[PDB]
Design a protein around this ligand. Sequence first.
Ligand SMILES: *[C@@H]1O[C@H](CO)[C@@H](O)[C@H](O)[C@H]1NC(C)=O
Ligand code: NA
Lengths: 30, 245, 17
Amino acid sequence: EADCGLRPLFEKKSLEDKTERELLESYIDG
Amino acid sequence: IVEGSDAEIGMSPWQVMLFRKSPQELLCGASLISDRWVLTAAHCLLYPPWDKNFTENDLLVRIGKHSRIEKISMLEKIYIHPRYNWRENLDRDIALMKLKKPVAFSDYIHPVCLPDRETAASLLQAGYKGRVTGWGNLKEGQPSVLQVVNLPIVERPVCKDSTRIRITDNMFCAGYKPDEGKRGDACEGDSGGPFVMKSPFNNRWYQMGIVSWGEGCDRDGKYGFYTHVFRLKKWIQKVIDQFGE
Amino acid sequence: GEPGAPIDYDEYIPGIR
Ligand SMILES: *[C@@H]1O[C@H](CO)[C@@H](O)[C@H](O)[C@H]1NC(C)=O
Ligand code: NA
């Protein structure tokens, strides 16, 4: 739906979960 | 999930559990993609070699669960990919399930996105990590809390070399290589659950894969195989456009 | 860097899981 993928308890509160940084690092780091 | 950790509250609000209705038993994972549609693996519903053929009246789903606020939903209809190949390799291991009533979104219930082409091309790269969640066995027991593990996508020649099963374009594989030191895998009971990735472009979580199959769990040199959700998106859209509410 | 699977649309004992 229009709001998909934005979690009420994280993205919508500008909070990150404990391991999502690991995903972002894999996308950026060589 | 093998070598995972306990999920935080609301960390995977698209998580769905697929149950046999009677006798009650946890069958598979699944994911919420709208207030009426749930995505899972075809082999969770249909696997003739095991005389498995569940239809809507055999099943229920639990949405918004974290420990063993949560909604039990009945199914109106299920839809299995018409070219699902159970005989050879689980090609097109995908199914849709329509809820009898719309589920209310909450802090604990919220749908995941399906990828567009740009997102798929950007994120579905070897070495890039996705997230797998499930209530499956911890080794090749059941957990008290939803388990979460992050795993890197693996180069296709490495996936192919790891198994004697013929790999199709509708699958990708993920997991750590023997020399990478880290471990982790899906396992029995995690089938049908989502492999999700978070887009840096718009902060949204996208379901790139469906836990499909593997050889054992967390074996050195073996990888978990996942339904390539993007490649089958036109079938998903065809079902929802034809049978949507 | 390499795609883990093709970025196009489908046109038309298997594992221990
Ligand atoms: C599965 O069972 C349903 C009835 O519950 C039947 O209509 C359907 O044809 C079966 N699918 C098979 C045998 O592939
Ligand atoms: Na492995």
